[PDB]
Design a protein around this ligand. Structure first.
Ligand SMILES: Nc1nc2c(ncn2[C@@H]2O[C@H](COP(=O)(O)OP(=O)(O)O)[C@@H](O)[C@H]2O)c(=O)[nH]1
Ligand SMILES: [Mg+2]
Length: 856
């Protein structure tokens, strides 16, 4: 129930728009005769239709990690025998001389998996595929790759060994590589290395192990699996979607190329499904010292602590529990975690007088931080008695290492962890587990473009796994914070990611690797995705013109497939290159893969952070401005950079990683034939007239579509669906206090539409109505005076302007198509296209929509 917004467009500009449309002979939909018969302004707009990824074994003059020949140095002509012997002698000498390494090796030899060394190696040698199955903490991840390598080293065949190990997490690929390297008396870069999105330390070319994320490996596979003897797929039980996807690829590989070795490694689950998939391959069981764990539930926890709090399975409770327990539990909301009970449980654990670390499973960083703050508010849980350590993805690896370290006696180590500590890493000296019984999952619904970082129930399997983390040292205890009635209503297994994740990126991968049809290939998965997700992916890619009508990969699609970024941002980056603002658009795109550099602590931004925004009412401009300032401060060396980040309360690691990501995105564009000149760093002002920045904001609107909203008053905004929503507290556009903001336009585009208790728009950038029509709208209807954008908002603007702007969008799309066929035309672009681009440049300006940002 909102009146149409009145767009102040001058006669001069309206005529200029018409002239450009006329000069380029672009089709325009004429005005309607009857005002109750509205006309759609939206203008309309090949190759020939199961491949297998090739494999080849290691050879001496090939570097499989850089995917290039070894020409220079002695390794170009050296025989395998020479290489093998030199490495064997090097290693033998190291073991003789290094006492600290001897001690480290002695620890290795006591790991449960050590017993099974000969059996594993035997199995792998005799079979194209095996499964290694055993409890978490046995040493599958860290030892099995070493066992394989050392077997080849010690039998004079070091040169014939190159191992890829996939991990479902970035943090695991890096951390395992550093752990294994340490276990071999090295830094990463010698026998071990890693490769994640936008960061790698490559190992030596021979007798080497590479730990990587699945996405990294897949992007490399368009040239085949070249010079690799073993592919180890780790933690298959997590049902990471990219892992599931890779298993499909590998099954075809191993059938056509049975000399390759595949090793799938799994926790204690039913692996029948995987076994049958890979031609009833062997299962090698691994086990060690298991202690019994006494498990408790919310009833038990409340009773032994005497805790009293300030569909619903907390209303159900057995008769064998007392009336106050029933009463207490019946007050607890299941959607929350009882923080005060966890506090109470920690105190109860002290009275047992058996020392040991406590591991607390919490869904995400929010509840870890909430729990951590809660404890440090009580002096009881101070340095003298307690060492409370967070464990999640985004803490520095320095802090992550501290969870393994021992504490001075009398101090209790408490680890507030995500599910990383469920099956991927094992914290030693754990005797007590407190389990939220929750998981954190990212749900996305395409229809409304809604993101939900949802707190959901864990599975019975998860609870069993979490319970087992208390029983590696001595008889332990596990405090589940769900009712005994709730437990019964838990699913046995989590929904695999394949069932609940968008597939457009996997779809591009399928096409880049020439594996055939998208639906056809995914139908062969171990558990295929639902039909609707496939249709949504196909639709998404057709809309982008990544696929043609025949669903074959266009030049545009090929580029998007090579960019490790959301395809739509990939397209935004291409458009950025065309407008010669490639660097800024690569920066926006890179930043989506990392947390916010602003250390805001979940509060409203302060003065310093807000100032980066200038007068643009834009979180994206703020981001770009911190990168400009940060890069300037780096001129004066590391300490100047450190002090800048500390003074401005910025995460320096985030900035550095984002920068490196940007560099690589540029690299891929360069190699795709885009000119260097369209990707240069360009100084900008965030206060004064800046047409480069105007255009970036226009392209951002395209990037984040369909996320556009309309400001009503205060924090309340209207979404594409017509629903009410809030400006996120972290935005520069969120009012610091009670003083209202005077936006010169009510329209904003934003990065994420998030569902919690309300609908939130996060990462918000003001745009003009002209930018809305140009890049933030698919469907536009006009009655001659009023225009209806995607059936949610109305503009009072001339028919002709709206129609011309719609044609600009169409013309821009056509140019993008041409540019992807031949990217070098960017630098030598004909006048007719420059005319079209210049018109977009003009309507990107605030002044085009009657706005002057320098005047309040
Ligand atoms: N101190 C320490 N121990 C580690 C580290 N990474 C792994 N471990 C230990 O190595 C052993 C085997 O772990 P891992 O290979 O992950 O076992 P998996 O669960 O079978 O994959 C366990 O005792 C772990 O605690 C680390 O970074 N530091
Ligand atoms: Mg493991």
């Amino acid at each position: 129930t909102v009146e149409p917004y009145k767009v102040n467009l001058s006669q001069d500009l309206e005529h200029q728009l018409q002239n450009v449309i006329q000069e380029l002979n672009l089709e325009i939909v004429p005005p309607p005769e009857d005002p109750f018969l509205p006309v759609v302004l939206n203008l309309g707009k090949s190759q020939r239709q199961i491949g297998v990824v090739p494999w080849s074994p290691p050879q001496s003059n090939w570097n499989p990690w850089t995917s290039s020949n070894i020409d220079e140095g002695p390794l170009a002509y050296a025989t395998p025998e020479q290489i093998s012997m030199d490495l064997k002698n090097e290693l033998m000498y190291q073991l003789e001389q290094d006492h600290d390494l001897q001690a480290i090796l002695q620890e290795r030899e006591l790991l449960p998996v050590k017993k099974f060394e000969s059996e594993i190696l035997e199995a792998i040698s005799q079979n194209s595929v095996i499964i290694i199955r055993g409890a978490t903490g046995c040493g599958k991840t860290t030892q099995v790759p070493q066992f394989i390598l050392d077997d080849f080293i010690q039998n004079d065949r070091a040169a014939e060994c190159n191992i890829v190990v996939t991990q479902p997490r970035r943090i695991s690929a890096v951390s395992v590589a550093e752990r294994v390297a340490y276990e071999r008396g090295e830094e990463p870069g010698k026998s071990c290395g890693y490769s994640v999105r936008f960061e790698s330390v490559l190992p030596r070319p021979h007798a080497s192990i590479m730990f990587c994320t699945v996405g990294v490996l897949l992007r490399k596979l368009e040239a085949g699996i070249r010079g690799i003897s073993h592919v180890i797929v780790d933690e298959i039980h997590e049902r990471d979607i990219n892992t599931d996807f890779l298993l499909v690829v590998l099954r075809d590989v191993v059938q056509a190329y049975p000399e390759v070795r595949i090793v799938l490694m799994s926790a204690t689950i039913d692996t029948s499904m995987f076994c049958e998939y890979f031609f009833n391959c062997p299962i090698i069981e691994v086990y060690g010292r298991t202690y019994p764990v006494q498990e408790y539930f919310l009833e038990d926890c409340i009773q032994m602590t005497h805790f009293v709090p300030p569909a619903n399975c907390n209303l159900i409770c057995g008769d064998e529990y007392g009336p106050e327990t029933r009463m207490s539990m019946a007050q607890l909301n299941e959607k929350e975690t009882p923080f005060e009970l966890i506090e109470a449980l920690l105190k109860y654990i002290e009275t047992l007088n058996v020392p040991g670390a406590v591991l607390v499973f919490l869904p995400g960083w929010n509840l870890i931080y909430t729990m951590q703050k809660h404890l440090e508010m009580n002096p009881h849980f101070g340095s003298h008695r307690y060492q409370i350590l967070p464990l999640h993805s985004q803490i520095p690896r320095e802090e992550q290492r501290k969870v393994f370290d021992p504490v001075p006696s009398g101090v209790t180590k408490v680890i507030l962890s995500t599910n990383i500590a469920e099956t991927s890493i094992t914290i030693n000296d754990v005797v007590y587990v407190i389990d939220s019984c929750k998981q954190k999952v990212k749900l996305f619904t395409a229809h409304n473009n809604m993101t939900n970082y949802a707190t959901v129930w864990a599975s019975k399997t998860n609870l069993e796994q979490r319970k087992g983390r208390a029983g590696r040292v001595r008889p332990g205890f596990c405090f589940h914070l769900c009712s005994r009635a709730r437990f019964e209503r838990l699913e046995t297994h989590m929904t695999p990611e394949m069932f609940r994740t968008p597939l457009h990126e996997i779809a591009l991968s399928i096409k880049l690797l020439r594996l055939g049809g998208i639906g056809q290939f995914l139908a062969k998965a171990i558990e295929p995705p639902p039909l609707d997700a496939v249709i949504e992916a196909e639709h998404t890619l057709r809309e982008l013109d990544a696929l043609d009508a025949n669903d074959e990969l266009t030049p545009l699609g090929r580029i998007l497939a090579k960019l490790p970024i959301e395809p739509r941002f990939g397209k935004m980056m291409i458009m950025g290159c065309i407008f010669y603002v490639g660097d800024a658009v690569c920066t926006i795109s890179a930043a989506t893969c990392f947390p916010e550099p602003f250390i805001s602590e979940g509060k409203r931004l302060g003065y310093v952070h807000r100032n980066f925004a200038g007068n643009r009412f834009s979180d994206h401009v703020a981001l770009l401005s911190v990168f400009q300032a940060w890069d300037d401060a780096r001129m004066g060396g590391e300490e100047a950079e450190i002090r800048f980040c500390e003074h401005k309360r910025l995460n320096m690691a985030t900035l550095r990683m984002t920068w490196e990501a940007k560099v690589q995105l540029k690299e891929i564009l360069i190699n795709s034939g885009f000119p260097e000149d369209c990707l240069l760093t360009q100084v900008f002002t965030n206060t004064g007239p800046d047409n480069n920045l105007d255009v970036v904001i226009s392209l951002l609107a395209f990037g984040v579509y369909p996320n556009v909203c309309y400001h009503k008053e205060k924090r309340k905004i209207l979404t594409t669906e017509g629903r009410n929503a809030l400006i996120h507290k972290s935005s520069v556009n969120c009012p610091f206090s009670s003083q209202d903001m005077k936006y010169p336009s009510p329209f904003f585009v934003f990065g994420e539409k998030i569902r919690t208790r309300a609908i939130s728009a996060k990462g918000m950038t003001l745009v003009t109505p002209l930018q809305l029509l140009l890049f933030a709208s698919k469907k536009v209807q006009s009655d001659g005076q009023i225009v209806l954008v995607d059936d949610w908002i109305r503009l009072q603007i001339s028919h002709e302007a709206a129609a011309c702007i719609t044609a600009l969008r169409a013309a821009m799309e056509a140019l993008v198509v041409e540019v992807t066929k031949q990217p070098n035309i960017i630098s030598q672009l004909d006048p007719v296209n420059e005319h079209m681009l210049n018109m977009i440049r003009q309507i990107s300006r605030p002044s085009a929509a009657g706005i002057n940002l320098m005047i309040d």
